[PDB]
């Protein structure tokens, strides 16, 4: 015989560069973060974009909303810019190679007592550089407790953190 | 505490390869069960031994 080595749960890693520009125009000021998450998570409805990149954007969208600062002018406006290089473990099989081609997303939302628009601009591409990079879970201030699993889920991210090592992106949900 | 809940093998799917195919699985290990998943065989066994429930 020859070993059966096929594994759809193979824990592959990713190294990448990323950019996040996010603007959220809203009718009134957000009460909780939970509300922001809802509005921002609409970004992907009617998704036009790179199939193999969709999971990563969810992470950046999540990261976006984590940093959104209010523009004092505008009728409320929120803005965030996030940039860096990171290392991400996941269980999603062979990722196609990612090239620096910014992709554009702009859509509306109507939930609870809030209606408006989310504008998102995102880049993700391979980093062949052998130099060390921090886990993407480190660009989140709040990835230091289990509540984090809940928050990630609002963006369709299913994350694990076991007895050793960082959070691992186990899978991605698209609906709900 | 111990192996009081009867053994019932969890089921699932898996692939099988260069002759690629699809199957069904029966996991023949008690700790695969949701009830016991937090312990190890030697843990359970010891709990059974002290309970004298051999």
């Amino acid at each position: 015989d020859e070993m059966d080595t096929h594994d759809p749960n193979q824990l592959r890693y990713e190294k990448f560069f990323f950019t996040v520009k996010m603007t959220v125009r809203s009718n009134r000021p957000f009460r909780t973060y939970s509300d922001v998450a809802a509005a921002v998570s609409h970004w992907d409805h009617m998704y036009i974009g790179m199939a193999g990149k969709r999971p990563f954007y969810k992470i950046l969208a999540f990261l976006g909303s984590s940093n959104l600062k209010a523009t004092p002018g505008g009728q409320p406006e929120y803005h965030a810019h996030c940039e860096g290089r990171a290392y991400l473990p996941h269980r999603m099989g062979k990722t196609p190679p990612m090239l620096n081609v910014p992709e554009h997303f702009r859509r509306p939302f109507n939930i609870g007592l809030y209606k408006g628009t989310i504008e998102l601009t995102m880049t993700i591409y391979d980093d062949e550089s052998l130099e060390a990079a921090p886990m993407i879970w480190d660009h989140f201030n709040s990835s230091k407790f289990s509540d984090f699993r809940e928050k990630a889920l609002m963006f369709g991210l299913i994350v694990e953190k076991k007895a050793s090592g960082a959070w691992v992106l186990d899978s991605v949900s698209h609906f709900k | 505490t111990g192996t009081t809940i009867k053994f019932n093998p969890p089921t699932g799917t898996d692939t099988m390869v260069g002759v690629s195919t699809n199957i069904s699985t029966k996991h023949q290990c008690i700790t695969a069960m949701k009830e016991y998943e937090s312990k190890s065989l030697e843990e359970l066994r010891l709990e059974d031994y002290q309970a004298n429930r051999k």
């Binding site: 592959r12 050793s164 | 699985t25 023949q28 843990e43």
Partner: protein
């Protein structure tokens, strides 16, 4: 395949052959009857019952000192004993707050010690003459299995914890790995590179699967892989726990043993199965090789993989020996 004279009353947890610094071969076995037994294995295949020791609870792991004079025993009774074989006298060298799962000998140029791994979520280091630990290490969970080859140690914990250690000077955490396996960790074995250095490990889950993991490989994405094993088989395929795992100390190929009552030999470089045995009357609970790897020990016992119900206190527990250095050669 050849039996062993006067094998244990209850199930066998561990096996360990003597180091090369001892003339001839000597086997050690620990059981859930609380006892440890020592045989001398002769070339002839015959085995002479030599000596015995007692714990006040089941014995979970055994191992030898580098120089052959000592056997170290790990038990549920929350202690580890050191056993001087010449005088058949044993003494206590370790204590934990819970059962001791793993026991190893560390022989480092700088220093020498015993490393105990326990379900009290710690790793402890003992010089064998004092009663204080000389070094205590916190683990993220209950210690489930471990292996040692200087200057590297791997430890697997509950909740799929996986940790690598460096042993130069004082032992310290080297890397906290995110486990390649998605099911409970069961057993691990450190493998070497061609230049004979600690270079990786093999990890076995309960889900009929082993992971091959290189510490520092040119391309992790292909070099680090996982393979299915111990699975019987239109019908549903039966999945069994890998209970033990040992490398050939000379050839670099490995032995795996499962709940299904089979052993298998594998070539991890060629990624090829070599041999899968006959199914036995009960699971194979423990296994290993003699100092040079001519003899492959393996015990047939109930591993409790189906709960208290399928335990038949009456069935014999066998240990088998297989004079097979020829069966374990790559091509």
């Amino acid at each position: 395949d050849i039996e062993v004279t006067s094998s244990p009353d209850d199930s066998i947890g561990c096996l360990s052959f003597s180091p090369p610094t001892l003339p001839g071969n000597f086997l050690i076995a620990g059981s859930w009857a609380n006892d440890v037994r020592c045989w001398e294995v002769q070339d002839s295949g015959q085995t002479i019952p030599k000596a015995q020791q007692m714990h006040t609870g089941p014995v979970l792991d055994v191992c030898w000192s580098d120089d052959g004079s000592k056997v170290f025993t790990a038990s549920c009774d929350k202690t580890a004993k050191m056993w001087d074989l010449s005088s058949n006298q044993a003494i206590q060298i370790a204590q934990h707050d819970a059962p001791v799962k793993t026991i190893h000998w560390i022989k480092a140029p700088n220093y020498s010690c015993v490393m105990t791994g326990s379900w009290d979520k710690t790793l402890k280091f003992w010089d064998t003459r004092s009663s204080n630990p000389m070094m205590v290490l916190q683990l993220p969970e209950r210690c489930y299995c471990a292996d040692v080859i200087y200057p590297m140690a791997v430890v697997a914990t509950a909740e799929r914890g996986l940790i690598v250690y460096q042993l130069e000077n004082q032992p310290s955490e080297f890397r906290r790995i995110e486990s390649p396996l998605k099911h409970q960790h069961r057993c691990v074995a450190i493998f070497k590179d061609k230049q004979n250095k600690p270079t990786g490990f093999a990890l076995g889950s309960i889900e009929g699967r082993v992971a091959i993991h290189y510490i520092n490989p040119p391309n992790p994405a292909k070099d680090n892989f996982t393979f299915k094993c111990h699975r019987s088989n239109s019908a549903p395929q039966d999945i069994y726990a890998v209970n033990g795992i040992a490398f050939h100390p000379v050839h670099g190929t490995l032995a795996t043993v499962g709940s299904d009552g089979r052993f298998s030999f594998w070539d991890k470089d060629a990624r090829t199965k070599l041999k899968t045995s006959e199914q036995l009357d009960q699971p194979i609970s423990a296994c290993c090789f003699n100092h040079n790897g001519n003899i492959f020990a393996y015990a047939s016992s109930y591993d409790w993989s189906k709960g208290h119900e399928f335990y038949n206190p009456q069935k014999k527990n066998y240990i088998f020996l297989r004079n097979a250095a020829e069966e374990l050669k790559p091509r």
